[PDB]
Design a binder for these strands. Structure first.
Ligand SMILES: [Mg+2]
Ligand SMILES: [Mg+2]
Ligand SMILES: [Mg+2]
Ligand SMILES: [Mg+2]
Ligand SMILES: [Mg+2]
Ligand SMILES: [Mg+2]
Ligand SMILES: [Mg+2]
Ligand SMILES: [Mg+2]
Ligand SMILES: [Mg+2]
Ligand SMILES: [Mg+2]
Ligand SMILES: [Mg+2]
Ligand SMILES: [Mg+2]
Ligand SMILES: [Mg+2]
Ligand SMILES: [Mg+2]
Ligand SMILES: [Mg+2]
Ligand SMILES: [Mg+2]
Ligand SMILES: [Mg+2]
Ligand SMILES: [Mg+2]
Ligand SMILES: [Mg+2]
Ligand SMILES: [Mg+2]
Ligand SMILES: [Mg+2]
Ligand SMILES: [Mg+2]
Ligand SMILES: [Mg+2]
Ligand SMILES: [Mg+2]
Ligand SMILES: [Mg+2]
Ligand SMILES: [Mg+2]
Ligand SMILES: [Mg+2]
Ligand SMILES: [Mg+2]
Ligand SMILES: [Mg+2]
Ligand SMILES: [Mg+2]
Ligand SMILES: [Mg+2]
Ligand SMILES: [Mg+2]
Ligand SMILES: [Mg+2]
Ligand SMILES: [Mg+2]
Lengths: 84, 244, 204, 134, 46
RNA sequence: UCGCACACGCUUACAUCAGUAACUAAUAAUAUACUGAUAAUUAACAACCAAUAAACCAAAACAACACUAAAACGUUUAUUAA
RNA sequence: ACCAAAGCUAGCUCAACAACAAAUACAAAAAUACACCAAAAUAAAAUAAAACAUUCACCUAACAUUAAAGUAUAGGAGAUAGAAAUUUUUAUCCUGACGCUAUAGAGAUAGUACCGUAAGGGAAAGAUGAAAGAAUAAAAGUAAAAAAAAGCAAAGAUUACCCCUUCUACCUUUUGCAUAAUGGUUUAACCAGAAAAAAUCUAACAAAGAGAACUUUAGCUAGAUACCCCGAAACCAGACGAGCUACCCAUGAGCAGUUUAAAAGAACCAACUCAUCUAUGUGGCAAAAUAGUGAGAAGACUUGUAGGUAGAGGUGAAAA
């Protein structure tokens, strides 16, 4: 299964930071297989993978965004991150 | 379809909402009611009733002010409440002749005016009428304090008024720094016109200047959530210590 | 997911060949009236036993494959049936398959397990706060059909490949709720020391 | 990193850092014959050369000698049923060349390893429906 | 001599006469944009 | 026998493999112009790429030197230039 | 038998009530260097007055509603324009439809295709079924089924299609049209008479009648009876246009040979520029060309890129 947020809330910062690259490399490998499969005129094996590695990354983002956006409220009290 | 409220009232319901609601009441009250400007170009007839020459019956007679135009320069000087009269005229004054577009411009002069309250000499473009009223009011500062908003017509006049009115209500020592005697004299004869302090600073403003000043008086950068959370926690701890 | 404003659901998946053939890119067809049933008022699920009250085949019992909520259809496995060939080549017609014809929800009642009869199912919230289906006629609790999932992966029979994370590790809580952000955290952890600071910057 | 704001650089600022990199790469089989030392990557549009070099070296530990980039233009010419144009996306292509004398070759990704009815009508029957026996 | 070829394409002249900036510099240009938004055009300005 | 480049301008119309009953070609054959899938032009050329003070009257014309209609175009010194 | 034909929906009318994120004004969608900002002057005419000059409602504002009243007044005292004093008004709730069905109703499946440099213009279309994870034969035009002396095409008739006999297409327009006057290939769908002063007709109640204000010497009050469609050249305001062409301002670039002391608004003759004369062409190859033949060809010469002047105007080696 792809990572659900609740599973990610439990990881510390360094662990998320590391998970990011394990996710990254897998994404590149999938992407390459994608293109290659398109060139060889052959259907691509287990497409589900590409959907999954997206979600987790997308999930991972949500988790860090919160930890910034919470903390910046707790410090400054300006809701939006960029001035405007 | 239709509009829930007519448009002439759109411009009004603009004020009833948002930041305008936080403006001081006196300002708004002053803006709403408009005392009708003293006739300058057209010439009024006092009586409410007249007697028709041909008809021989009493006639209800009303007065319609003539629309006059204020150029952008006029807003910088004191023109005595007048301006350009745009209109048409009949050549020869026979209604049967040609009708022709025409504009009467007021005659302008370059003059200097002396303030007791502002203690200064200004170079203002004035009209003859301005000097006449300055005359009849017996002072330049008298002319500015004794006159309503509609009669001056100039941003310069109303910011003049605001400036020196503020100077009156502050009882500023900077007026005649070395002479308490001239302070006594100068402040005394205008003492008829003293207004409180919160009123004086809002008197000359324009809706944009009001909105801006209000904006600045209302600026508070948001309290850190840390603060409010600490307050709440301390409240809880004190209630817990008191209940025990 | 790709959808047009006027669309007809043909038992075929929205993103599929049979569907692009059914309603090609430029079709707009007559409106299909759908008697509104709000999600919370919907008493049917896939997998439960139902009785068919309508048609040539009625009074019978059957299991529900899937519900299509858009046009409001239920699917009974091999019950309402019409015949469709699969392989057809020039000299040969192969694989005659009996195929499930869709059924409206007015023709299908939910069957309570114990005495096997058709009933009107009505939602009740119990004292403990669960949402159960109570029969009006029989006065019973009617279960909802615990059913497999689309991917065909059963959680009980499962093995980790190289890239599968073992449950123990994934569940482990390593989080230490302190006030740093990811940047200062990682930078402090990696031992990267930075001295010089940003000059003042204006924002317009 | 793509789509992010970058801090405005002035004199003596902190070395710019990106902890979670936003880019993504494709390694693509070259459409034309190129030397053993060349590999080809479609990258995202907003990625600089220097970025692709560092990205390759630090993520994948590749010793890269040379990088070059060009921008490929996707056709605007195919039309919808509404007769509005479909635009294939534009995309950036990079050529990298390996420093230590290493030879690459694109892996064949599809090895080929996997895991009779005659019902024809009878010529001498003359159209008689054979199932029926008599 | 023969006519109808009057339009000689130039990218600089095109952006300089009809481009977004040229519109925005003058009040009436602004109203060209405004009217074109009120009619809801896919392309406001050259 | 209006050939090869660049400038301006066009935007994938270019390349490979495949299909053409019917669409494009004003007909066919087959295909640079129709349809699908896949690819593609890689910078040393070209674009982007400092200011302020001060000296300097003295044409291009194969440039000796001139002609009248009086001529486009910068070096060098000083002060600072990530 | 082809071509075709049929659905009822998408939606409209009218009225009550009241996905971030980045990127953007560099030549918008380009992170990043020294500035400037910003501005305002009555609406005119078309048209009515059977012309046209004074004058011409509505077009800005709100003020509503029943009256005073189309009255006082204002008007080339014409056309027309037109008040006020003073009077009247019970609450919300209670939403729908003698409104349209794909030439209708929105322009709309769209401000999209496409047409314009630009402001700007601006379309066309959909139809089986529960399930396609099941495969009526009725418009014109034609085909089945070329045509046999003769004549507005038919009619009287006949045993009989013709053959006989009798007849100047139809509208519009005119004194008068078979006219050799206008109009139309044919089919389908769209496509043009609106008002209530006085009057008449039918009823109510009557010296009175009207659910307020008015009119009354049989009157009042109510109903019913009424007055088209498509076309200029124009005129006025505000936008957008100098990528063509007119003339300028920048910054570039060409001009070989031959003759002559010569780059001399000199000769000869190419490139390059013009357009003389003839023939082709005339729904062309081309909304101005091609073939021959011609003028000029170091100059008031041709030509590239980029600015500028805008209609009450510009520009003009004046051809309005
Ligand atoms: Mg690059
Ligand atoms: Mg390059
Ligand atoms: Mg044209
Ligand atoms: Mg080019
Ligand atoms: Mg063909
Ligand atoms: Mg007239
Ligand atoms: Mg007339
Ligand atoms: Mg006339
Ligand atoms: Mg008028
Ligand atoms: Mg329509
Ligand atoms: Mg265009
Ligand atoms: Mg027929
Ligand atoms: Mg005959
Ligand atoms: Mg006759
Ligand atoms: Mg006619
Ligand atoms: Mg005649
Ligand atoms: Mg005749
Ligand atoms: Mg004629
Ligand atoms: Mg005629
Ligand atoms: Mg005709
Ligand atoms: Mg009447
Ligand atoms: Mg009578
Ligand atoms: Mg006139
Ligand atoms: Mg006229
Ligand atoms: Mg220009
Ligand atoms: Mg020009
Ligand atoms: Mg020569
Ligand atoms: Mg000569
Ligand atoms: Mg000849
Ligand atoms: Mg000659
Ligand atoms: Mg000569
Ligand atoms: Mg000339
Ligand atoms: Mg002349
Ligand atoms: Mg003439």
């Amino acid at each position: 299964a792809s990572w659900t947020c609740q599973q990610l809330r439990n990881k510390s910062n360094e662990d998320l930071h590391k998970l990011w690259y394990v996710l990254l490399k897998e994404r590149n490998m999938l992407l390459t297989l994608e293109q290659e499969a398109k060139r060889q005129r052959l259907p691509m094996p287990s497409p589900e993978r590409l959907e999954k590695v997206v979600d987790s990354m997308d999930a991972l983002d949500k988790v860090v965004q919160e930890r910034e956006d919470a903390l910046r409220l707790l410090q400054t009290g300006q809701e939006k991150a960029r001035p405007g | 379809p239709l509009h829930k409220v007519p448009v002439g009232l759109w411009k009004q319901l603009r004020l009833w909402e948002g930041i305008y609601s936080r403006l001081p009441r006196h300002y708004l009250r002053s803006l709403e009611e408009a005392r009708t400007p003293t006739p300058v170009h057209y010439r009024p007839h006092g009586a409410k009733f007249k007697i028709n020459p041909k008809n021989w019956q009493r006639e209800r007679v009303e007065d319609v002010p003539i629309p006059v135009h204020y150029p952008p320069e006029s807003q910088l000087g004191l023109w005595g409440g007048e301006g350009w009269v745009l209109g048409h005229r009949y050549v020869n004054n026979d209604k049967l002749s040609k009708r022709v577009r025409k504009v009467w411009k007021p005659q302008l002069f370059q003059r200097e005016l002396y303030s007791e309250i502002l203690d200064k000499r200004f170079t203002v473009t004035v009209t003859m009428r301005t000097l006449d009223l300055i005359d009849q009011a017996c002072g330049f500062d008298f002319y500015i304090l004794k006159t309503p908003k509609e009669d001056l017509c100039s941003k310069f006049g109303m910011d003049l008024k605001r400036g020196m009115l503020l100077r009156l209500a502050r009882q500023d020592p900077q007026l005649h720094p070395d002479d308490p005697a001239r302070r006594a004299a100068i402040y005394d004869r205008y003492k008829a016109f003293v207004i409180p302090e919160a009123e004086a600073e809002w008197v000359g403003l324009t809706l944009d200047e009001a909105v801006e000043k209000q904006r600045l008086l209302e600026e508070k950068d948001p309290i850190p959530l840390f603060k409010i959370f600490v307050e709440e926690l301390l409240g809880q701890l004190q209630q817990q210590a008191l209940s025990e | 997911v790709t959808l047009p404003p006027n669309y007809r659901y043909g038992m075929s998946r929205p993103g599929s060949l049979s569907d692009k053939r059914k309603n090609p890119p430029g079709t707009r067809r007559r409106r299909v009236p759908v008697e509104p049933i709000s999600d919370e008022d919907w008493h049917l699920f896939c997998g439960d036993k139902v009785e068919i009250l309508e048609g040539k085949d009625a009074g019978k019992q059957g299991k529900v494959v899937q519900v299509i909520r858009q046009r409001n259809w239920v699917v009974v496995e091999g019950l309402n049936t019409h015949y469709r060939y699969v392989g057809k080549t020039v000299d040969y017609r192969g694989t005659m398959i009996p195929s499930e014809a869709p059924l409206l929800h007015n023709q299908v009642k939910l069957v309570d397990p114990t005495d096997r009869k058709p009933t009107d199912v009505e939602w009740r919230f119990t004292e403990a706060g669960e949402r159960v289906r109570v029969s009006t006629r029989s006065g019973r609790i009617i279960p909802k059909p615990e059913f497999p999932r689309a991917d065909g992966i059963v959680p009980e029979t499962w093995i980790d490949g190289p890239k599968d994370t073992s449950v123990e590790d994934a569940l482990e809580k390593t989080y230490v709720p302190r006030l740093k952000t990811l940047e200062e955290e990682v930078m402090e952890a990696m031992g990267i020391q930075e001295t010089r600071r940003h000059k003042k910057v204006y924002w317009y | 990193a793509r789509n992010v704001l970058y801090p405005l650089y002035q004199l003596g600022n902190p070395q710019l850092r990106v902890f979670r990199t936003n880019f993504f790469i494709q390694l693509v089989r070259p459409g034309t014959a190129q030397p053993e030392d060349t590999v080809q990557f479609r990258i995202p549009m907003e990625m600089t050369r220097v970025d692709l070099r560092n990205y390759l070296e630090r993520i994948y530990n590749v010793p890269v000698a040379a990088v070059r980039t060009r921008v490929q233009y996707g056709s605007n010419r195919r039309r919808d049923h509404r007769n509005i144009r479909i635009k294939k996306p534009d995309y950036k292509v990079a050529y990298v060349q390996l420093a230590l004398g290493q030879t690459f070759t694109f892996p064949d990704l599809f090895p080929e390893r996997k895991g009779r009815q005659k019902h024809s009508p009878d010529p001498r029957r003359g159209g008689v429906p054979g199932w029926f026996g008599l | 001599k023969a006519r109808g070829n009057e339009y000689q394409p130039s990218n600089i002249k095109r952006k300089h006469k009809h481009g977004w900036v040229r519109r925005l510099r003058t009040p009436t240009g602004v109203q060209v944009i405004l009217r074109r938004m009120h009619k809801g055009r896919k392309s406001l300005s050259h």
